[PDB]
Structures are given as structure tokens and as C-alpha cells.
Write a protein that holds these residues in place. Structure first.
Motif, PDB file in Angstrom:
ATOM      1  N   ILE A  94      30.813  53.105  47.586  1.00  0.00           N
ATOM      2  CA  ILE A  94      31.079  53.156  48.767  1.00  0.00           C
ATOM      3  C   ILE A  94      30.003  53.310  49.584  1.00  0.00           C
ATOM      4  N   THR A  95      28.965  54.487  49.232  1.00  0.00           N
ATOM      5  CA  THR A  95      27.883  54.336  50.137  1.00  0.00           C
ATOM      6  C   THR A  95      26.958  53.050  50.200  1.00  0.00           C
ATOM      7  N   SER A  96      26.839  52.485  49.314  1.00  0.00           N
ATOM      8  CA  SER A  96      25.944  51.066  48.881  1.00  0.00           C
ATOM      9  C   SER A  96      26.713  50.192  50.006  1.00  0.00           C
ATOM     10  N   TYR A  97      28.095  50.092  49.971  1.00  0.00           N
ATOM     11  CA  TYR A  97      28.784  48.963  50.606  1.00  0.00           C
ATOM     12  C   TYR A  97      28.549  49.045  52.146  1.00  0.00           C
ATOM     13  N   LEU A  98      28.836  50.279  52.477  1.00  0.00           N
ATOM     14  CA  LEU A  98      28.805  50.847  53.910  1.00  0.00           C
ATOM     15  C   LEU A  98      27.331  50.702  54.556  1.00  0.00           C
ATOM     16  N   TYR A 136      42.369  36.689  50.264  1.00  0.00           N
ATOM     17  CA  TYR A 136      42.208  35.966  49.144  1.00  0.00           C
ATOM     18  C   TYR A 136      42.620  36.928  47.894  1.00  0.00           C
ATOM     19  N   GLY A 137      42.952  36.574  46.835  1.00  0.00           N
ATOM     20  CA  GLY A 137      43.099  37.440  45.728  1.00  0.00           C
ATOM     21  C   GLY A 137      41.842  37.214  44.751  1.00  0.00           C
ATOM     22  N   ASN A 138      42.154  37.029  43.605  1.00  0.00           N
ATOM     23  CA  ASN A 138      40.745  36.965  42.692  1.00  0.00           C
ATOM     24  C   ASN A 138      40.506  35.662  42.157  1.00  0.00           C
ATOM     25  N   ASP A 139      41.244  34.572  42.270  1.00  0.00           N
ATOM     26  CA  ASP A 139      41.052  33.170  42.074  1.00  0.00           C
ATOM     27  C   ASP A 139      39.894  32.743  42.426  1.00  0.00           C
ATOM     28  N   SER A 140      38.923  32.548  41.384  1.00  0.00           N
ATOM     29  CA  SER A 140      37.582  32.225  41.815  1.00  0.00           C
ATOM     30  C   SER A 140      37.416  31.044  42.713  1.00  0.00           C
ATOM     31  N   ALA A 141      37.935  29.758  42.520  1.00  0.00           N
ATOM     32  CA  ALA A 141      37.902  28.770  43.340  1.00  0.00           C
ATOM     33  C   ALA A 141      38.164  28.918  44.902  1.00  0.00           C
ATOM     34  N   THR A 142      39.132  29.873  44.842  1.00  0.00           N
ATOM     35  CA  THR A 142      39.433  30.182  46.450  1.00  0.00           C
ATOM     36  C   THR A 142      38.564  31.270  47.090  1.00  0.00           C
ATOM     37  N   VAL A 143      38.176  32.314  46.243  1.00  0.00           N
ATOM     38  CA  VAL A 143      37.457  33.309  46.870  1.00  0.00           C
ATOM     39  C   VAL A 143      36.189  32.629  47.267  1.00  0.00           C
ATOM     40  N   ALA A 144      35.612  31.438  46.682  1.00  0.00           N
ATOM     41  CA  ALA A 144      34.359  30.788  46.816  1.00  0.00           C
ATOM     42  C   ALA A 144      34.421  30.278  48.151  1.00  0.00           C
ATOM     43  N   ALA A 145      35.688  29.907  48.785  1.00  0.00           N
ATOM     44  CA  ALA A 145      36.171  29.209  50.033  1.00  0.00           C
ATOM     45  C   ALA A 145      36.107  30.560  51.186  1.00  0.00           C
ATOM     46  N   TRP A 146      36.134  31.824  50.871  1.00  0.00           N
ATOM     47  CA  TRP A 146      36.196  32.666  51.712  1.00  0.00           C
ATOM     48  C   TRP A 146      35.425  32.490  53.075  1.00  0.00           C
ATOM     49  N   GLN A 167      39.336  44.099  48.622  1.00  0.00           N
ATOM     50  CA  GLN A 167      38.177  45.042  48.110  1.00  0.00           C
ATOM     51  C   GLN A 167      37.040  44.340  47.748  1.00  0.00           C
ATOM     52  N   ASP A 168      36.673  43.183  48.044  1.00  0.00           N
ATOM     53  CA  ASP A 168      35.492  42.687  47.642  1.00  0.00           C
ATOM     54  C   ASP A 168      34.679  43.016  46.530  1.00  0.00           C
ATOM     55  N   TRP A 169      35.311  42.973  45.369  1.00  0.00           N
ATOM     56  CA  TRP A 169      34.578  43.634  44.203  1.00  0.00           C
ATOM     57  C   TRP A 169      33.745  42.507  43.729  1.00  0.00           C
ATOM     58  N   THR A 170      33.634  41.368  44.356  1.00  0.00           N
ATOM     59  CA  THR A 170      32.613  40.191  43.777  1.00  0.00           C
ATOM     60  C   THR A 170      31.470  40.437  44.915  1.00  0.00           C
ATOM     61  N   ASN A 171      31.685  41.241  45.994  1.00  0.00           N
ATOM     62  CA  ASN A 171      30.727  41.154  46.983  1.00  0.00           C
ATOM     63  C   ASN A 171      30.381  39.728  47.809  1.00  0.00           C
ATOM     64  N   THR A 172      31.519  39.211  47.787  1.00  0.00           N
ATOM     65  CA  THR A 172      31.554  37.783  48.548  1.00  0.00           C
ATOM     66  C   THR A 172      31.467  38.025  50.104  1.00  0.00           C
TER      67      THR A 172
END
Length: 302
Positions: free
Chosen positions: A207-211, A130-140, A169-174
Motif C-alpha cells: 500500500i505504502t509503496s504504491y501511494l 480492464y480485467g487481467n487479459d494481457s493483450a488488453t491490459v497492454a492497451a491501458w 487493482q493494478d497488480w501488474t503496476n501498469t
């Protein structure tokens, strides 16, 4: 049969030996003539190669005999082969991108060349799906769970590797916040999450938070792609590599060679010449927490 598999949030070979991925991506689909890369990547100490394939949606499909050849080159060079369908990249934003279901259709077409290779091959369902489009990110989470379920119902027992939304990159933390749902959807437990760390990850704390989120929860994770600090977005590769080593997490840098115009600084070697490393190639293979100093070959080859 199963081969590579997950237990207690970590990746293991069938014999019980933990496997910590230390490799690079090789752009096979776009450079079919550079199959010398497999031997070259092993010569510098890598234990895994992530191979760019296409399901035909955006690029030219890698057929069964071609994929069989790729798997043979991984095995002859004593490399674990992580195959990935690149056509899913940026779905919802990128024009003409493949869905994960279309990637699964392609994995099913390759079934005969993949079954029996579970000790040697990891299936990365679709790159940065997925790119950044919200409606499709929501379906991840639901799309990824569905893709996993289809593969399992089709008889695949390989460990599966699934990428994040937001161009990996999961910047939305989905993926961060819904990986538990996805992991639950694989009854075998043989699913590994993969984060791609570029510009979103210029700060060490992020980085550390994510890992640590993944390690603390027992969610299996690899850094399936990452770049360096002179690259677009300035990912902190020193922190990425040090933390992957501290937390005993797999990492795969991008990329061996052949980057197009915007990402030539991500070439590890110049023009697919294994004897001509760039500063980035030197850094990831021979620098602190690098592949040559930390990587161990998979024990299946012995």
C-alpha cells in the motif's frame, strides 16, 4: 471554463483551495429509488459521492434528465459528485464489458448536462476498465490517453479521473509505471489517477509503496475504491486510511449499501437506511482517519 483542477500533483478548487476527497460510492444505477442516499452520505460528513452510472452497454443507461437530477442532489447536499461509467469493468476478461471509447460516447451524449458543472462534478471515465487479459491490459495507457483526448476535443474541461487495469487493482503496476504517459496526454493537466485497493493490498508495505510512488512523482492519485480486512482478499483498511491521511490523498470507500451476494460485507449501511450503520460503515465514517473526523466540505458550497 475550468473548476476543479490539478496543480503540483494535487486537486484544487478554482479558488486555489486544495480538495481532499473523503467519500463513498453509491450504486445509483442499480438502486434508482434510493436517492435519499445523497443527503444521508453528507449527514455523516462525506464531502464527495461517487455515483454508479451506466452507459447502457451492460446495465440500463442513465439518461440526461436522470443525470441532471443526480447532479442537483449532489449540489443541494453540498457534495462533490464523481460520476462513473460502470460498464467498462473488466474489459478484455468480463463478457460484454464496454470499452473506454464507448464510455466517452456516453459522456459526450451527456455534454449539455455536464458543461458548466466543472466546480461540482468529476468525471471518472470508466470503472476498472480492464480485467487481467494481457493483450488488453497492454492497451491501458493508449486507450486511456485516447479517451482523455476525445473528451478534451469534445470541449470537456472537467477534471477527469481514470481507473487502473487488473480490475482496478493494478497488480501488474501498469498504471503505476505508465501514468506519466497518460498524464502527459492531457494538455490541461486535469487528470487524476484512481487505484482500487482490495485483496492485492493486504500488505501495508505494498500500500505504502504504491501511494508514495504517486506522491513522490507528482502523479495525482485517489484511492477511488477500497474495502476492509474481513472482505475478500483482506485489504488493510487501517493502513489505507492512515496513509491516505498522512499523504493527504483522497479516498472513497465501497460502498453505501446494496452490495450483491458476494460483497454484502461491503455495505456501509443496512438496506439504504442512513441511521443503521454496519461495522464497516462505523469504521469508515467514525473510526481512525475516518470521514467524519477528517473530511472538509468543498469551499465552492460556501
Amino acid at each position: 471554463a475550468t473548476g476543479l483542477h490539478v496543480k503540483n500533483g494535487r486537486l484544487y478548487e478554482a479558488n486555489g483551495q486544495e480538495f481532499i476527497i473523503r467519500g463513498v460510492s453509491h450504486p445509483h444505477n442499480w438502486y434508482p429509488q434510493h436517492t435519499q442516499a445523497f443527503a444521508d452520505i453528507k449527514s455523516h460528513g462525506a464531502n464527495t459521492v461517487r455515483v454508479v452510472l451506466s452507459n447502457g452497454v451492460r446495465w440500463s443507461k442513465n439518461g440526461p434528465s436522470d443525470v441532471a437530477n443526480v447532479i442537483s442532489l449532489c449540489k443541494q447536499n453540498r457534495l462533490i459528485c464523481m460520476l462513473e461509467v460502470h460498464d467498462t469493468t473488466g474489459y478484455g476478461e468480463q463478457s460484454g464489458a464496454s470499452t473506454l471509447d464507448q464510455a466517452v460516447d456516453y459522456w459526450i451524449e451527456l455534454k449539455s448536462v455536464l458543461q458548466g458543472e466543472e466546480d461540482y462534478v468529476l468525471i471518472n471515465i470508466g470503472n476498472e476498465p480492464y480485467g487481467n487479459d494481457s493483450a488488453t491490459v497492454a492497451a491501458w495507457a493508449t486507450d486511456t490517453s485516447a479517451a482523455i483526448q476525445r473528451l478534451r476535443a469534445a470541449g470537456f474541461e472537467h477534471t477527469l479521473v481514470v481507473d487502473a487495469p487488473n480490475w482496478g487493482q493494478d497488480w501488474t503496476n501498469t498504471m503505476r509505471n505508465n501514468a506519466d504517459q497518460v498524464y502527459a496526454s492531457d494538455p490541461t493537466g486535469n487528470t487524476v489517477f484512481s487505484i482500487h485497493m482490495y485483496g492485492v493490498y493486504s500488505q501495508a508495505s505494498t500500500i505504502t509503496s504504491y501511494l508514495e510512488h504517486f506522491v513522490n512523482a507528482g502523479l495525482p492519485l485517489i484511492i477511488g475504491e477500497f474495502g476492509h480486512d474481513h472482505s475478500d482478499g483482506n485489504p488493510d483498511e487501517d493502513t489505507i486510511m492512515a496513509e491516505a491521511e498522512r499523504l493527504k490523498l483522497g479516498y472513497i470507500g465501497w460502498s453505501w449499501s446494496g452490495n450483491g451476494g458476494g460483497v454484502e460485507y461491503l455495505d456501509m449501511v443496512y438496506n439504504f437506511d442512513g441511521d443503521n450503520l454496519s461495522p464497516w460503515g462505523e469504521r469508515i465514517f467514525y473510526g481512525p482517519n475516518g470521514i467524519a473526523s477528517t473530511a472538509k466540505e468543498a469551499v465552492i458550497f460556501g
